[PDB]
Subunit: 99 residues, 5 copies
């Protein structure tokens, strides 16, 4: 399960906690209006990975991408803190877990 | 198979959906006129990977390259949204699947 | 255990040495106030990865992130030099060990 | 063997096609006059990886380096389009094959 | 053993050739005075990887760091061309071997 630190952090926001997600697809799209980076879960849920041009969020968003790839390749689960304001929901934090 | 999301998004465009592709070769070329990044499938199909200098497309295009390498190394399948307007067809979206 | 070199370096500083840590979670967060990169140990300990905007520290911080990911994927242990001035403690140096 | 696409592209040039090469060593050098990135095959052949500072060839040359490392780690073979004009021969295109 | 090419290149310089090294630790440090990237061998030898902000050495130095991590993760041996003018000795060239 999600670390208590990860849960506490997500609980201070308007975003929602999703635990123990198996990501089975990773999408890169440059088409008009659908452009972005996405992940799809084993049950068909879809989330947008945040992007940012400048420091310091350019670092965190790059690491969210690496976490997504690593999850898809390995079958390791993730915990997400995702805003329900938009569709697909935007990932504001993510936790890769080995166990 | 391709996610419904991926399919819906490709369906909005002039590009073609290609599902369950096994990529077996990855090409980097700097020669005049053939310069680019390409992938080749197990049946001999060839696609050009999109490129972009600036943000935000420089992110997506970098991740296309990472998906292509990961598919070649692992034998994981991909789904593509590829324009037939040129040869080789250009990848506008790609989905790596476990 | 930590190399003597790593131990000596950490000893010059106000930071604390932590040896033989198994990292099992890796966190990226962009939320207000909690924004950052973190690692979590197998027993629940939490550390923040250093960030830096400019050269040369942004090189070293990038490699800390790579070490963290590699440790989580592989189960390889790390040794850390971490400052108690903030919570979670900030990683000033890290050593990945085979 | 090399894809027909890869062969056709190399055929347009003054470079030579080399097929089914096992790369066993990967070299980074910053010494005066020998500075560069190189690969060494299982028979002892040496090639220089192309380098470029600007877009778009900075993308392709980075992917050549990624291909070279991936080949060394995995034992996956490569096909090269390499110019005999210099020594070591310079890689103008490379194909990683599963 | 080290390629003839690698040996010849090191033998042009005042540096020392070290062959068949097993790297077991990789270090990233941002602390004053010890800041840098280092590797430690299975026998406790320590070497520093150089840093460079600009092209072209920013490429070669990045690849030295990739070689170091790959060696630590895999147990693949390296050959080094290392100068005794600094302590730890500085890596001027490195060769990863399968
Ligand atoms: C990624 C991120 O910024 N997350 C914020 C979030 C967004 O900025 C906001 O919802 C716009 O999309 O804002 C959060 O709420 C903030 C409050 O904590 C603060 O009192 O007031 C802020 C506006 O001045 C903002 O509403 C949220 O929605 O939970 C915090 C979250 O980290
Ligand atoms: C990657 C990308 O930009 N994809 C676009 C695509 C191309 O921009 C375009 O084909 C030129 O290379 O354009 C798409 O929509 C086109 C419209 O912009 C155009 O006005 O009308 C076209 C119909 O013939 C078409 O609608 C496309 O070709 O599907 C949208 C796509 O995301
Ligand atoms: C990587 C690259 O630029 N490759 C080119 C190559 C080089 O630009 C050139 O050899 C200098 O390194 O040039 C090629 O085209 C050549 C023409 O530039 C030359 O005028 O005539 C040559 C025939 O003797 C040749 O056509 C080449 O050498 O093949 C094309 C290649 O993509
Ligand atoms: C990462 C870093 O810079 N660490 C350095 C710190 C910090 O600059 C200050 O504590 C202010 O945070 O200063 C030292 O004197 C210390 O406290 O040991 C040396 C150390 O190398
Ligand atoms: C692929 C290619 O032609 N690379 C050449 C580059 C590029 O022209 C520039 O770096 C601009 O991208 O210039 C060099 O002096 C270099 O950087 O080593 C020689 C090299 O052959
Ligand atoms: Na909430
Ligand atoms: Na379509
Ligand atoms: Na100390
Ligand atoms: Na030719």
């Amino acid at each position: 399960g999600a670390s208590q630190f990860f849960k506490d952090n997500c609980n201070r926001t308007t975003a929602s906690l999703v635990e123990g997600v198996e990501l089975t697809k990773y999408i890169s799209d440059i088409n008009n209006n659908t452009d972005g980076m996405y992940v799809v879960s084993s049950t068909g849920g879809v989330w947008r990975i945040s992007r940012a041009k400048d420091y310091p969020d350019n670092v965190m968003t790059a690491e969210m991408r690496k976490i997504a790839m690593a999850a898809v390749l390995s079958g390791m689960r993730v915990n997400m803190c995702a805003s329900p304001a938009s569709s697909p929901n935007v990932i504001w934090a993510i936790e890769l877990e080995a166990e």
